[PDB]
Automatic annotation (TrEMBL), chain A:
Top-level lineage group: Viruses
Name under which the protein is recorded: Major capsid protein
Location(s) in or outside the cell: Virion
Amino acid sequence: MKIADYGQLGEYTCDAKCDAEFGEPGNIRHLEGKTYDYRGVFCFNRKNLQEA
Amino acid sequence: FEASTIGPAFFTPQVLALEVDCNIECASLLDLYGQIEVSRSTFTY
């Protein structure tokens, strides 16, 4: 997971007002990755390898 | 590392204990001849 944002909630308001507003809530994101592979191959000649 | 791509230094040949010699020496007639012993550079008879 990752917390992208927290958002804004609440504000200072005039006392005479009798209600309040809705803010803009934050955002959360789901992320994922991957794993990679390394490979190779090599070959020999038996007699040459044995006599070297 | 194929043997056909690297230098000869990586392979040491087997050392054999034999030698080839075709030379000859003919038989001698020396023992037929008469033998004489001297101790000076000249002689008389």
